[PDB]
Amino acid sequence: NEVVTREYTINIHKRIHGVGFKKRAPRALKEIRKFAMKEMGTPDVRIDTRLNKAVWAKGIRNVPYRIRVRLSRKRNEDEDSPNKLYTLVTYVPVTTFKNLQTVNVDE
Amino acid sequence: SMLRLQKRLASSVLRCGKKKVWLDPNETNEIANANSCQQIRKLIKDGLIIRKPVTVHSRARCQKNTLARRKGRHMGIGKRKGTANARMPEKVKWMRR
Amino acid sequence: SSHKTFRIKRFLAKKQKQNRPIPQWIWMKTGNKIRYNSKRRHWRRTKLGL
RNA sequence: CUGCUUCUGGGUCGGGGUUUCGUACGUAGCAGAGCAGCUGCUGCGAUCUAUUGAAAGUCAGCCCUCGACACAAGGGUUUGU
RNA sequence: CAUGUUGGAACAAUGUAGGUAAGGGAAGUCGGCAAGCCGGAUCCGUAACUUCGGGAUAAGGAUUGGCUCUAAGGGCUGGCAG
RNA sequence: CCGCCGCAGGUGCAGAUCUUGGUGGUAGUAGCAAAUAUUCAAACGAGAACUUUGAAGGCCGAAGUGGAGAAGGGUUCCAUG
Numbered sequence: 001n002e003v004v005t006r007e008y009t010i011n012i013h014k015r016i017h018g019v020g021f022k023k024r025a026p027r028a029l030k031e032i033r034k035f036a037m038k039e040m041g042t043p044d045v046r047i048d049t050r051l052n053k054a055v056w057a058k059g060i061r062n063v064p065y066r067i068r069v070r071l072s073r074k075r076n077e078d079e080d081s082p083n084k085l086y087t088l089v090t091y092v093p094v095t096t097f098k099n100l101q102t103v104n105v106d107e
Numbered sequence: 108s109m110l111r112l113q114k115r116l117a118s119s120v121l122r123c124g125k126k127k128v129w130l131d132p133n134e135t136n137e138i139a140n141a142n143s144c145q146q147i148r149k150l151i152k153d154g155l156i157i158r159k160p161v162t163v164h165s166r167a168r169c170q171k172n173t174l175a176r177r178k179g180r181h182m183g184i185g186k187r188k189g190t191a192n193a194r195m196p197e198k199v200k201w202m203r204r
Numbered sequence: 205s206s207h208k209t210f211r212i213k214r215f216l217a218k219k220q221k222q223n224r225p226i227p228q229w230i231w232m233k234t235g236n237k238i239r240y241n242s243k244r245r246h247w248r249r250t251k252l253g254l
Numbered sequence: 255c256u257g258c259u260u261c262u263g264g265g266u267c268g269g270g271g272u273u274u275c276g277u278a279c280g281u282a283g284c285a286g287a288g289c290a291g292c293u294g295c296u297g298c299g300a301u302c303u304a305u306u307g308a309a310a311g312u313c314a315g316c317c318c319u320c321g322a323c324a325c326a327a328g329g330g331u332u333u334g335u
Numbered sequence: 336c337a338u339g340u341u342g343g344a345a346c347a348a349u350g351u352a353g354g355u356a357a358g359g360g361a362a363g364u365c366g367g368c369a370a371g372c373c374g375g376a377u378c379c380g381u382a383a384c385u386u387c388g389g390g391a392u393a394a395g396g397a398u399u400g401g402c403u404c405u406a407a408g409g410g411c412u413g414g415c416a417g
Numbered sequence: 418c419c420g421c422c423g424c425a426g427g428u429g430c431a432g433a434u435c436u437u438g439g440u441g442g443u444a445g446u447a448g449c450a451a452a453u454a455u456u457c458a459a460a461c462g463a464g465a466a467c468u469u470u471g472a473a474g475g476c477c478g479a480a481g482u483g484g485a486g487a488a489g490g491g492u493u494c495c496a497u498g
Contacts, residue, residue: 006323009267017314018346022454025474029456039266039324049472052457056474060454065311066267102267102323108461109469112496124483132471135460139469142496178403185399187376194376203409205488216491223492247493254490 002085005072007092007103010035012055013065021061028055028063036087040073044086051091068092070105113141117156120144129157212254219245219252 015031016024029047032055036045055063070090076083094100110130118125130138134155141147150156175181187194208216226241245252 004324008323011267011314013311014314026454026456035266041325047457049458053473056456059474060456097268099268101321104323111469114470130470132459135470139461175402180402181400183399183401184377185375187399190376200408205490207487208491212491220492247491252491 003074003107004040005070005105005107006039007100007105008035008039008069008071009066009094009097009100009102010069011066012063016063023060024063025056025060032067032069032089035069036071036089040071040087042073042083042085042087044076044081044083045089046086047089048091051089054091066097068094068097068100108135108139110135110138113138113147113156116141116144116147117151120147120151121156121158123158127159127161129159131155131157 010032012028012031015035016028019027029052032051033045033047036047037043051067051069054067058064068091070092072088072090073085074088076086114125114128114130117128117130121128138150138155141150147156172181222243223245224241225244226238230236230238
């Protein structure tokens with residue numbers, strides 16, 4: 001119920017539309033963080049180093065239009081922020097987004 | 108917490124730039140209490156501080172292009188920016204002759 | 205500069221030794237008026253002449 | 255200016271519709287100026303032809319979904335004749 | 336090296352700094368100011384005037400990519416081969 | 418410290434674009450816009466847009482934002498707190 005992991009394709013292209021060249025990739029990280037808070041209501045969204053890398057792969061201006069993302073709500077580690085759970089947003093390499101549904105991947 | 112003393116020393120001992128000093132981010136606190144070059148030379152032997160390899164500047168497409176230049180490709184009339192004299196001077200042609 | 209005369213390096217020596225704060229037992233003396241050293245001199249602010 | 259359970263609702267993604275651009279990569283070809291080798295085969299070769307009105311983008315302030323996916327009967331501050 | 340002594344969020348007007356504009360083309364303006372045109376190299380071609388030095392990149396044209404070839408221009412060693 | 422009788426004067430401030438010191442309104446305002454750009458994770462820590470480490474994306478581009486010096490500075494060097 002709480003340790004839930006779900007696949008998602010995030011249309012970055014329609015969350016980045018009209019932002020300036022030197023703020024596209026920085027903004028793309030902030031809508032993937034909003035996307036985590038929205039689907040899995042956790043303020044503590046920790047976004048994987050490889051997903052950062054994946055967004056920045058084409059540089060600051062050019063960003064992947066769609067990125068596949070594993071979104072995993074988990075039990076928080078010790079020295080607790082009052083946020084009971086956090087979301088770990090992990091990159092999933094994909095060759096085609098054509099006919100990719102949101103899948104409830106299981107433990 | 109602060110490894111500036113130990114990245115500076117590591118750069119001096121490796122005889123490289125501090126650009127190329129890799130400090131193991133996992134064993135940070137064991138690098139932290141180095142404080143001397145002799146202590147850092149141990150962490151080079153232990154392979155905790157490592158010289159990063161040189162960022163590659165391959166001149167392979169340079170060679171591929173220079174091989175085309177040898178056959179007269181890319182050397183046409185609309186690729187000549189300096190004068191015929193500037194490119195290959197008449198005084199050097201004469202000297203040769 | 206790096207190249208100095210002996211005369212200037214003795215001048216610069218005295219000015220260094222004058223640039224220390226008062227000892228914390230000087231204000232415990234009977235007729236103390238000194239709170240802190242007023243004649244302190246930072247190397248950006250006041251440029252020591254020359 | 256709007257929306258926030260008539261078992262319904264917006265939202266995310268997907269899929270169609272529209273549309274922009276002009277025919278993707280890969281593979282195939284006794285298409286290709288010619289050239290090199292080996293006794294016709296084999297290479298190197300811009301480009302060309304088919305696959306291919308292909309590929310790619312398309313609401314972020316396009317249209318349509320009843321296909322997936324979670325979410326939604328809350329929280330806060332006030333108001334009395 | 337961390338964007339020059341701060342970030343965050345929006346993308347109104349006025350700026351400042353960049354662009355682009357149908358048809359016309361200086362009608363604008365004190366004035367083509369500003370902007371734009373022009374630009375490299377090769378091959379042509381080049382006037383008035385002149386102190387014969389120039390003017391001169393005068394003006395005015397053509398060509399320029401990629402690719403596959405062809406020809407020409409050399410050393411070394413015992414009209415030649417290697 | 419003062420009343421009375423005398424004595425004496427550097428003896429009465431609203432101004433002098435007065436002097437010195439203090440404080441307003443302006444006003445939480447102008448502003449914190451020259452030289453392209455940051456991002457993710459971790460660590461220390463009461464506390465992190467800015468510190469440090471790692472990873473990414475960038476910039477200077479050898480007439481350098483590089484490595485050394487002369488003038489000038491004078492301890493700014495270095496470690497620890």
